[PDB]
Amino acid sequence: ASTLTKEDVLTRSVSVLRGFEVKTKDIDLQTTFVQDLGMDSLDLNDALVALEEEFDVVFDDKTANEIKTVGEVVDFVLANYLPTEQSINHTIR
Amino acid sequence: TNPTAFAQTTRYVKDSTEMRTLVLNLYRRYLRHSRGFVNNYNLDIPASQVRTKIRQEFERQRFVKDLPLKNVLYMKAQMEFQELVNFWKQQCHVMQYFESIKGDSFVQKFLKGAQ
Amino acid sequence: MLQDLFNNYVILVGILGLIFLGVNYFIVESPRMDENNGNISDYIEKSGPFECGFSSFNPIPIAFILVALLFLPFDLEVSSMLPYIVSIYSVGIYGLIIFILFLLILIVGFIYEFNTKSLSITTILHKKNKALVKNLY
Amino acid sequence: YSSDLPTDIPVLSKRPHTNLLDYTFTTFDKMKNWARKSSFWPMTFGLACCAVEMMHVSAPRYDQDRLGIIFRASPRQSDIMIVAGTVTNKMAPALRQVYDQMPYPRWVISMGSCANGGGYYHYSYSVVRGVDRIVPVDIYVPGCPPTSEALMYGVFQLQKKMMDGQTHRMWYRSY
Amino acid sequence: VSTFPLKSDINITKSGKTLLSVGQGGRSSRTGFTATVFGGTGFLGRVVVSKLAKHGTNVVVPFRNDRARRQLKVNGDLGVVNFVEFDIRNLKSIEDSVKYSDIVINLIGTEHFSKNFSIEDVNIGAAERIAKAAKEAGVSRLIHVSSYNANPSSSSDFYATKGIGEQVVRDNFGPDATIVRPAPMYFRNSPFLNELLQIKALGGNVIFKKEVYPVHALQVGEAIERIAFDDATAGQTYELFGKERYSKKELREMIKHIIHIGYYPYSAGFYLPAPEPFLYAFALIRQYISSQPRFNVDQLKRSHINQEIDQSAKTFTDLGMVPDELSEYLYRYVKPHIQNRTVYSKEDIEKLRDYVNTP
Amino acid sequence: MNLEILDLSILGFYSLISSNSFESIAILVATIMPVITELWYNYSQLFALLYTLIYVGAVVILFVFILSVINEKESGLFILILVLLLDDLDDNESNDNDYNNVYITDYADWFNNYNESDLSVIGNLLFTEYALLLLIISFILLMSIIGLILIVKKD
Amino acid sequence: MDLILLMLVAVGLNIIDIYIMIEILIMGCTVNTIYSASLDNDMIGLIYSLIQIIIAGVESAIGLSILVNYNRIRNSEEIE
Numbered sequence A: 001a002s003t004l005t006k007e008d009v010l011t012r013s014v015s016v017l018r019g020f021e022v023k024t025k026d027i028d029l030q031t032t033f034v035q036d037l038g039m040d041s042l043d044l045n046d047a048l049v050a051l052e053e054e055f056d057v058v059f060d061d062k063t064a065n066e067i068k069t070v071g072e073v074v075d076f077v078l079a080n081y082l083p084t085e086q087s088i089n090h091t092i093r
Numbered sequence B: 001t002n003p004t005a006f007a008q009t010t011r012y013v014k015d016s017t018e019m020r021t022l023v024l025n026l027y028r029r030y031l032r033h034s035r036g037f038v039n040n041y042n043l044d045i046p047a048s049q050v051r052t053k054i055r056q057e058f059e060r061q062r063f064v065k066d067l068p069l070k071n072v073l074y075m076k077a078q079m080e081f082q083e084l085v086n087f088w089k090q091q092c093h094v095m096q097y098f099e100s101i102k103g104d105s106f107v108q109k110f111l112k113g114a115q
Numbered sequence C: 001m002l003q004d005l006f007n008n009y010v011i012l013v014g015i016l017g018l019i020f021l022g023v024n025y026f027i028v029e030s031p032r033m034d035e036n037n038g039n040i041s042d043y044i045e046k047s048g049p050f051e052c053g054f055s056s057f058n059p060i061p062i063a064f065i066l067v068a069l070l071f072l073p074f075d076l077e078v079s080s081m082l083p084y085i086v087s088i089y090s091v092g093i094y095g096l097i098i099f100i101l102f103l104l105i106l107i108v109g110f111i112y113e114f115n116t117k118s119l120s121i122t123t124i125l126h127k128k129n130k131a132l133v134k135n136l137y
Numbered sequence D: 001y002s003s004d005l006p007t008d009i010p011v012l013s014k015r016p017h018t019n020l021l022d023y024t025f026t027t028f029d030k031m032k033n034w035a036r037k038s039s040f041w042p043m044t045f046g047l048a049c050c051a052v053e054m055m056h057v058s059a060p061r062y063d064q065d066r067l068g069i070i071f072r073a074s075p076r077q078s079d080i081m082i083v084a085g086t087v088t089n090k091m092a093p094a095l096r097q098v099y100d101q102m103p104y105p106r107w108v109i110s111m112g113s114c115a116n117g118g119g120y121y122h123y124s125y126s127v128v129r130g131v132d133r134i135v136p137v138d139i140y141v142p143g144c145p146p147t148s149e150a151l152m153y154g155v156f157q158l159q160k161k162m163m164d165g166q167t168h169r170m171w172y173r174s175y
Numbered sequence E: 001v002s003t004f005p006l007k008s009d010i011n012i013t014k015s016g017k018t019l020l021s022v023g024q025g026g027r028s029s030r031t032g033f034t035a036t037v038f039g040g041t042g043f044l045g046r047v048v049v050s051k052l053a054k055h056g057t058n059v060v061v062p063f064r065n066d067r068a069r070r071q072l073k074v075n076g077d078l079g080v081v082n083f084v085e086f087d088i089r090n091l092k093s094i095e096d097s098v099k100y101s102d103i104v105i106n107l108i109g110t111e112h113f114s115k116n117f118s119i120e121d122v123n124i125g126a127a128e129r130i131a132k133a134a135k136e137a138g139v140s141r142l143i144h145v146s147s148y149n150a151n152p153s154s155s156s157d158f159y160a161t162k163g164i165g166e167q168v169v170r171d172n173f174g175p176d177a178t179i180v181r182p183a184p185m186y187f188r189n190s191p192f193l194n195e196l197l198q199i200k201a202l203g204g205n206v207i208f209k210k211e212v213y214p215v216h217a218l219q220v221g222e223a224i225e226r227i228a229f230d231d232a233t234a235g236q237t238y239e240l241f242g243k244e245r246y247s248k249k250e251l252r253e254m255i256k257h258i259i260h261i262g263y264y265p266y267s268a269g270f271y272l273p274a275p276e277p278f279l280y281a282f283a284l285i286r287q288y289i290s291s292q293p294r295f296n297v298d299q300l301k302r303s304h305i306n307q308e309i310d311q312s313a314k315t316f317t318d319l320g321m322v323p324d325e326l327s328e329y330l331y332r333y334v335k336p337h338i339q340n341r342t343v344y345s346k347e348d349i350e351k352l353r354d355y356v357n358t359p
Numbered sequence F: 001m002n003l004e005i006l007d008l009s010i011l012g013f014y015s016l017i018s019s020n021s022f023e024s025i026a027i028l029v030a031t032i033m034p035v036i037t038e039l040w041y042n043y044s045q046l047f048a049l050l051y052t053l054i055y056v057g058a059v060v061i062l063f064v065f066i067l068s069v070i071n072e073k074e075s076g077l078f079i080l081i082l083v084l085l086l087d088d089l090d091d092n093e094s095n096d097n098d099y100n101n102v103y104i105t106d107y108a109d110w111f112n113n114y115n116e117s118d119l120s121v122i123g124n125l126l127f128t129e130y131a132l133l134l135l136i137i138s139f140i141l142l143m144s145i146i147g148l149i150l151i152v153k154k155d
Numbered sequence G: 001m002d003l004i005l006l007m008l009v010a011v012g013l014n015i016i017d018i019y020i021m022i023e024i025l026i027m028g029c030t031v032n033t034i035y036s037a038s039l040d041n042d043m044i045g046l047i048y049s050l051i052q053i054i055i056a057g058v059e060s061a062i063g064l065s066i067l068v069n070y071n072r073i074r075n076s077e078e079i080e
């Protein structure tokens, strides 16, 4: 099942964001990405890819130019989180 | 005939804005495969190092201006992506790719032989 | 009767096996003798897989997996005819008629696999063609 | 400490047998080298026009098999590596991987001009100028292509070197 | 290395020869020198020889093993790498490798005495003959390599003979000779590391409690290269070592943890508590029964002695080179022996080192 | 000094430390071989062979056949030794002390002038006396042949 | 030390390991039967053993056939 809730994404999101050069250390749902954190194209891609490495959710090309806030990413993970299929050994024994 | 993995048609893009978005997705594609490039080629540098070098590669040549020369730079960078992701370059070439690289005063160059 | 001679033969082959293992560990020249460049464990280049020179990174078909599974029945059929071999005389005609029935039941198994073409590897993933037809409007 | 090294004691390849051990470890060296001298199994590393001659040695006229030569495809089963043909830059990294997988002892024969020093394509942008930049070589066969006898002559000279190996006497006398 | 090693194109040696380097420093370039690297077929030589040849210096490598010298010729161009068959007991063959040599490097040094040589006969008898013979042929520069803990009065045979090796050279070659003391180097197939990776290491607690100052072998390989092209560094004593201090037992568990080697260490033989007499007896017994160089009695004593830095000597920075730490290179050199590979970066070695020290 | 005991002690160890499916398959062979050998001596030589021809020759090389199509991924030592040593204390599967520690004999008779192998008697009974067992077993094997196809064959 | 169910530790942690344990367990009943048939000098018991080997053979095939189909199911996408 999908064990991630909204708070779990939000709590762990900051730690990744605390790992990159951010104008303010206060980040929540309302906080933006390009404006509040002053991130350009290449800067913002690293954080977006980094959240792909932790939340294990792939962002497509359609949402690429349509990301403007950090709450959207947190809500996006819930709609797009699945557990990787476990082999026959893990599932039933 | 069936084209290989990670192939794209060679198209002469006639828009300034579309090329901007094509590049941005491409840069993410390199970062997505950051873990793989370490495990595939057995590179001595960790995953964060490769992203650092990839960023140094993408930051380097972002200021080009000619659209006819934009497509050429996007075409060949696609080949570099396709060659690397398909695991085509040998191990040695990737190791030496990241292993490449202040000058000296005139007296220093005069004595040994300069160029 | 009396298999002491066979027993010694079994011992000798077992002892002879270690001689195949051990003779190499004594005859070969040590690593320092040829090039000294490294031990087998250290020489990762040599102690690695061979892939025609270039480095690289069995989902077998149904039929291959199906032939293997069908080996188990047919092998138990053949290996259960052993009692009739050593007693073909004494059981007489009665055993012979039973024996033929014991096969005719298994022939239906043979017949069934023949019709469904379960053994064939089959080629459905590819080799498809179509006829071009004009669509005048 | 106390030390006294003589000066007139000769080198290994010139040192005659003196005691009975010097005859024992010479027997082991000849017996072991005779095995490698006869069971001479190269690797089919034909790359270019030089590879045609390497096939004609196996042909019935010359019959490399009579001398105990059986080409083995896998590097593990092959103790020699006859590098025949041009070694392009695109191949040189791959060639090193094939060479490094040969268990010791291992020999390399460079046949033809391309494998020796560049040959016809010495001034090419994508041709290694001599395979000796990549793998150590024990004998060079000159030709374009070397005649089927020239390769056999090159094989024979390398055989004459293997029969001169003195490894197990080296432990007794030089180690 | 970079692009050209020589500081100046024309260099005059102590013998008056005027050597002019040509080319831009490639394989087909030259430097006009002739550096005889004794013991070049060894672990250290294959780095000393490689750097000298690629930059155009002729290398004369005297060897006693015929099948080990073949791979040294790849590094140089045609005629750059030369070979001379020799033995330390053949004086004439020694003088064949020094007749045309402007640089003579000594690397011969053993830890185990054999049925033909003792520890003194090699660290002294070879060194004395090599140094004295080189002088008579007008060799401009001599460079020598000794132990990192040379001491004339030490009870360890290796350290005692290596120290006397320093004296006997300077009484034979003279004031021009140089002595370089390398700390235990780590590299591919390094004898320093090969003892740590071995699974069946009897007396592992006793052997690995010794302390060291590990140094990257490439830098020592360049350290001799820097000294070779310079005449300002005659008559000195150099000790080369790494800043961060490491101990074998600290490394052995650090090494094992990267390879991820529950029950297995307790069974396969990782930790073999054996009595001190047994270790002494086992080494003596193999010394007459073995045929390949095994663990020696001398390395039983050395395990009780820690590495000592000598203040009379000169460090890497004296040559303008900053030594590199084992943290930045320990992972890659055991990468052969190790889902998703975890690459233990330079900083993360401490975090591994932290995990070893925590009980 | 029954060396049969040592082999089982080894197998009783690698069974506890078995990690991947390679180890478990090797347990099956390392169980069959002590079975086959202890039957070749002692009790019955005919069934020591009938094990090898059927167990190893049909099922075990089919075990490793399917296992290559499944997957290949990935207390201490004193506890495992302690478990074995306590498990080894009692090894008398029966508890009739008189029946275990007293030996017996049989008296041979010359009446059976028609000496025949144990397999001939089995054939003389399985094909005549108990023919129904044989014909049902054929029917079961028929079910498997049709059974195995329907499960695996996708079409 | 069997009343503590020690044998469960000795079983592997895959479905294929469970299959092995069953066949070992069934093989224990045949060795007991051959023990009983030989001592009694009875060939009726040896007929039973022959049937146990044959029947337990079929059960092995059906089990692996189900397992192979089950394992194929996960990797049954077949998009290309």
Ligand SMILES: CCCCCCCCCCCCCCCCCC(=O)OC[C@H](COP(=O)(O)OCCN)OC(=O)CCCCCCCCCCCCCCCCC
Pocket (backbone or CB within 6 Å): F007, F008, F010, F011, F014, F015, F018, F022, F023, F026, F027, F029, F030, F033, F034
């Ligand atoms: C002719 C005899 C040759 C014997 C070769 C193996 C000797 C080791 C002892 C195994 C026999 C003991 C009985 C247990 C069966 C094997 C189960 C097992 O775990 O084997 C372990 C074997 C050794 O590896 P090890 O390091 O000890 O364990 C951890 C491995 N990651 O690692 C393995 O997985 C084995 C790899 C080879 C498998 C070949 C097939 C198994 C052997 C079948 C012939 C042996 C018959 C049994 C003989 C002993 C009977 C008690």
Ligand SMILES: CCCCCCCCCCCCCCCCCC(=O)OC[C@H](COP(=O)(O)OCCN)OC(=O)CCCCCCCCCCCCCCCCC
Pocket (backbone or CB within 6 Å): F089, F090, G001, G002, G003
């Ligand atoms: C060196 C020695 C090595 C020996 C190897 C085994 C070591 C001991 C391992 C544990 C032993 C516990 C079982 C003991 C044997 C089984 C019971 C039995 O057979 O009886 C023995 C004992 C007393 O029997 P007794 O009254 O003397 O009979 C004489 C009649 N003339 O009967 C008893 O009273 C024992 C007490 C059992 C009652 C309490 C436990 C039962 C409740 C928990 C059971 C666990 C859950 C099981 C659930 C069942 C599943 C539905």
Ligand SMILES: NC(=O)C1=CN([C@@H]2O[C@H](COP(=O)(O)OP(=O)(O)OC[C@H]3O[C@@H](n4cnc5c(N)ncnc54)[C@H](OP(=O)(O)O)[C@@H]3O)[C@@H](O)[C@H]2O)C=CC1
Pocket (backbone or CB within 6 Å): E038, E039, E040, E041, E042, E043, E044, E045, E063, E064, E065, E068, E087, E088, E107, E108, E109, E110, E111, E117, E122, E145, E146, E147, E148, E182, E183, E184, E185, E186, E190, E191, E192
């Ligand atoms: N990191 C390290 O390896 C260490 C460095 N040192 C010292 O640095 C010096 C460099 O040695 P190193 O390369 O590292 O290790 P090696 O023992 O492999 O070097 C030995 C070299 O000297 C030769 N040699 C030894 N004995 C004789 C002999 N009787 N006659 C002729 N040649 C002989 C060897 O010849 P061949 O191999 O061809 O038979 C080889 O060329 C040594 O003295 C070493 O003790 C100090 C501590 C450890």
Ligand SMILES: CCCCCCCCCCCC(=O)OC[C@H](COP(=O)(O)OCC[N+](C)(C)C)OC(=O)CCCCCCCCCCC
Pocket (backbone or CB within 6 Å): D030, D031, D034, D163, D164
């Ligand atoms: C039990 C283990 C298995 C069997 C062992 C035998 C395997 C084959 C051995 C190959 C030998 C080999 O190669 O000998 C032939 C080589 C080839 O001569 P060359 O190399 O040019 O040197 C020879 C010329 N010199 C020395 C001047 C440079 O030497 C010999 O003429 C050795 C001398 C002849 C020995 C005859 C007397 C001993 C007889 C022993 C037999 C009863």
Ligand code: SF4
Pocket (backbone or CB within 6 Å): D048, D049, D050, D051, D084, D085, D086, D111, D112, D113, D114, D115, D119, D120, D143, D144, D145, D146
């Ligand atoms: S040397 Fe001549 S024959 Fe040989 S590969 Fe080169 S061109 Fe062809």
